[PDB]
Amino acid sequence: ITRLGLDDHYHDLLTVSWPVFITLITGLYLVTNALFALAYLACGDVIENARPGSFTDAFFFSVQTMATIGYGKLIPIGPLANTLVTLEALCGMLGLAVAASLIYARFTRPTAGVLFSSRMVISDFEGKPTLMMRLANLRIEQIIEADVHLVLVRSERRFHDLTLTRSRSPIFSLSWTVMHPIDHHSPIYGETDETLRNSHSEFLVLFTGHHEAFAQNVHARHAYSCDEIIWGGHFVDVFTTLPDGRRALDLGKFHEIAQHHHH
Amino acid sequence: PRILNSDGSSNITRLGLLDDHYHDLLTVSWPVFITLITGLYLVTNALFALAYLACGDVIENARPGSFTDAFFFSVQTMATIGYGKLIPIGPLANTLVTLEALCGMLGLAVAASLIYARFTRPTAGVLFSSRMVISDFEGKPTLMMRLANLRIEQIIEADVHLVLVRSEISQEGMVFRRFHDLTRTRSRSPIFSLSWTVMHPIDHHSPIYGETDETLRNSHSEFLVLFTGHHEAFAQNVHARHAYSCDEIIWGGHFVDVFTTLPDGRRALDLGKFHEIAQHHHH
Ligand SMILES: [K+]
Ligand SMILES: [K+]
Ligand SMILES: [K+]
Ligand SMILES: [K+]
């Protein structure tokens, strides 16, 4: 949709692509050394072993000054240079820190290793026709206090928050089948493939939890369409018992769904 | 005189108040912060120059006794620039050179900690409607206000609070400001991206049931709005505040549909009319 309506720097800095970010920084960096060279130059021949007036001699000097490399070939002369050498060194620090702050922020974006089942199903469970889909954790580290939100979307556009058998799993480690008993209170009570489509119904799934791996929260999203609900489907058990009498988890069949056919 | 600024901020004059450093360091303005740091930095080199000087002529290629020669020296020492023209001499300088370098590190880290802290503040891009309304919806007179997300990145698990704040008298005849948490049709929106009209059905349970412009005003009633949610842009939480007065509720107002069709046949959200409110008039 067409939105009718610098200024938002911290956001843009984080949002912008990695390449763009590196440029914006290289730019700010090249530029400030360019201002510091114009300073050293503006004091007269204040740098030693730099050609008189030569901007490029003061640039490389300022670089190894803000950058504290300090080769020694080009040193400052007097109180003037030695005071732009003092401030400029402060700017390198102030410079670096902000960089690292942003570098840390954009970098430390943790991602849930969560895999969503490609389809949903509606089949009977505990007597009631129940809407189901399932999640699986792609990593070893466990997600504590996971919890899922199952939201229906349809035209009437309205959001309905579908009640779940289990809204939150205190320890999500392997797999988790989420379930919405369709009882007389379900927004989709007596609904049907046809009726569902007519309303343009979609399904939003929201996952979050604490990730032990990162020691921070994570979030995952996914959305299904009527198209993607298998009426009467049952998710294939994804847990085996190997030769060795041990239990195992086969994600190979994570999106497998069983169904019965006749005429 | 309003009790709560449009801000969310409370409009009230307080009274009767290195002691709170971490707070002040974060709170102070950016310019003041840079000064406080430039000050601490200039000062410590000034103490290290008085040290090198206090050992005798311990720096090479520095004029004897000259404080300024040891200042620059100490600068390029704490700062590790290391030109080399002025080097330390003996065990004394070379041991203030060892500690002073430790301080540059300890110095830089704290700086960065604070720099990171003050800098890493995400802001919700949320826009609050300038006014509220009370008009019929689904039969019931319903209190409404609306929010818009000024960015593209969506806010997930947004959720909103609508707080009445007004003066009441206890049964023991006692006047105080109470806050009421107004029940919303929708308290949370799982995905907030464009616009959102928040609604409090005024039913027989509403703290403002049967209330009216006049009665509202007598009680000094105000409305606090609190918004929070996860911002996909920052990958962190955000929060927004705002507050209205009775003055700012339009009875019988309806918010102008803010969803347009441009000349493309294309669907557009026009924030231009975000605070537009329609109203009937009499005689
Ligand atoms: K260095
Ligand atoms: K360094
Ligand atoms: K160096
Ligand atoms: K050197």
Instruction: Indicate which CATH number applies to the domain containing B253.
Output: 2.60.40.1400
| Domain end point (choices A63, A84, A110) | A110
Strand A2-4 and strand B267-270: the pairing is parallel
Q: Is the dihedral of CA B201, B206, B210, B216 positive or negative?
A: negative
Contact criterion met (CB below 8 Å) for B52 and B58: yes
Experimental technique behind these coordinates: X-ray
CATH number, position B113: 1.10.287.70
- CB-based neighbours (< 5 A) of ligand 1, an ion: A 68; B 80
Which residues in chain B touch residue A5, judged by CB atoms under 8 angstroms apart? 150, 270-272, 274
Q: CA–CA separation, A40 vs A81, rounded Å? A: 6
Across the interface, whether the CB atoms of B123 and A11 are under 8 A apart is answered yes
Q: Is the dihedral of CA A13, A18, A23, A26 positive or negative?
A: positive
Mutation to test the A interface, candidates B61, B76, B155, B266, most A Cβ within 10 Å: B76
Resolution expressed in Å: 3.1
Q: What are the Cα distances from residue B60, in Å, to A1, B47, B88, B94, B119?
A: 70, 19, 6, 12, 41
User: From the CA of A68, how far away is ligand 4's center (Å)?
Assistant: 9
Phi and psi torsions of B179, nearest 5°: -100, 135
What sign results for the dihedral spanned by CA atoms B213, B218, B219, B225?
positive
Residues contacting A202, CB < 8 A, separation 6+:
A152, A153, A154, A223, A224, A225, A226
Kindly list the residues of chain A whose beta carbon comes within 8 Å of any beta carbon in chain B: 1-5, 8, 10-11, 14-15, 65, 68-70, 72, 75-76, 79, 82, 85-86, 89-90, 92-94, 96-98, 100-102, 104-105, 109, 149, 151, 159, 161, 204, 206, 208, 219, 221
Which residues partner with A120 through β-bridges? A229
Residues B248 and B274 reside in one and the same domain: yes
Residue A229 Cα, gap to closest chain B Cα (Å)? 21
A143 and A258 assigned to the same domain:
yes
Nearest CA in chain A to B83: A72
How far apart CA A5 and CA B78 sit, in angstroms, is 49
- Phi then psi for B165, rounded to 5 degrees? -140, 125
In a domain, B36, yes or no: yes
For residues A36 and A80, membership in a common domain is answered with yes
CB within 8 Å of B163: residues ≥ 6 apart? B179, B180, B181, B182, B223, B224, B225, B226
Contact A152, A201 (CB under 8 A): yes
The C-alpha atoms of residue B7 and residue A250 are separated, in whole angstroms, by 54
**Gap between the Cα atoms of B78 and B105, Å rounded:** 8
User: What is the number of domains present in chain A?
Assistant: 2
Q: Which 3 state secondary structure label does DSSP give A174?
A: coil
CB atoms within 10 A of CB B31: 8
B151 and B278 part of one domain: yes
Contact A101 B82 (CB under 8 A): no
Nearest to A86 by CA among B48, B196, B257: B48
| Containing structural domain, residue A152 | 111-263
- Quick check: helix, strand or coil at residue A113? coil
Strands (E), chain A: 2-4, 114-116, 120-125, 128-137, 143-154, 158-161, 168-172, 175-181, 202-211, 216-225, 229-231, 234-235, 239-241, 247-249, 257-258
State whether A154 and A216 are in the same domain. yes
Residues A43 and A98 in one domain: yes
Determine the distance separating the centroid of ligand 2 and the alpha carbon of A80, expressed in angstroms: 24
Of B122, B146, B180, the residue that ends a domain is B122
In a domain, A81, yes or no: yes
Contact B252, B135 (CB under 8 A): yes
Same domain, yes or no: A63 and A180: no
Tokens of B219: 């009680």
**Which among B76, B116, B274 has CB closest to A101?**
B116
Considering only CB atoms, A204 lies closest to which of B83, B150, B190, namely B190
A15-to-A3, A27, A103 alpha-carbon distances in Å? 19, 18, 12
Tokens of B44: 């410590």
Nearest to A25 by CA among A35, A43, A13, A9: A13
Tokens of A40: 């050293």
Alpha-carbon distance A202 to A155, whole Å? 10
Asked if the Cβ–Cβ distance from B271 to A4 is below 8 Å, we say: yes
Q: Kindly give, in sequence order, each residue whose CB lies less than 8 Å from that of residue A161, ignoring residues fewer than 6 positions away.
A: A149, A150, A151, A152, B190
CB atoms within 10 A of CB A101: 20
Assign 3-class secondary structure to chain B. Answer: CCCECCCCCECCCCCCCCCCHHHHHHHCCHHHHHHHHHHHHHHHHHHHHHHHHECECCECCCCCCCHHHHHHHHHHHHCCCCCCCCCECHHHHHHHHHHHHHHHHHHHHHHHHHHHHHHCCCCCCEEECCCEEEEEECCEEEEEEEEEECCCCCEEEEEEEEEEEEEEECCCCCEEEEEEECCCCCCEEEEECCEEEEEEECCCCCCCCCCCHHHHHHCCCEEEEEEEEEECCCCEEEEEEEEEEHHHEEECCEECCCEEECCCCCEEEEHHHCCCEECCCCC
* Ligand nearest the Cα atom of residue B104: 2
Do A146 and A86 have their domain in common? no
A-chain residues near B233 (CB < 8 A): 11, 14-15
Q: Which of A237, A120, A255 is nearest to A182 (CA)?
A: A120
**Identity (one letter) of the amino acid at B190?**
P
Number of A–B residue contacts, CB under 8 Å: 127
Which amino acid appears at position A195 of this protein? T
Contact between A88 and A62 (Cβ < 8 Å): yes
Question: Is the Cβ–Cβ distance between A133 and A164 less than 8 Å?
Answer: no
> Is residue B207 within 8 Å of B180, Cβ to Cβ?
yes
> With 0-12 CB in 10 A as exposed, 13-18 as middle and 19+ as buried, what is B54?
exposed
Amino acid at position A200, single letter = H
Which chain A residues have a beta carbon less than 8 Å from that of B82? 68, 70, 72
Whether residues A260 and A164 share a domain: the answer is yes
B108 CA distance to ligand 2 middle (Å): 9
> How many CB atoms lie under 10 A from the CB of residue B11?
12
* Residue ending a domain, choose from B59, B87, B122: B122
> What secondary structure letter does DSSP report for A261?
-
Q: What is the dihedral of CA A201, A202, A206, A207, to 10 degrees?
A: 120
Look at residue B5 and tell me if it is in a domain: no
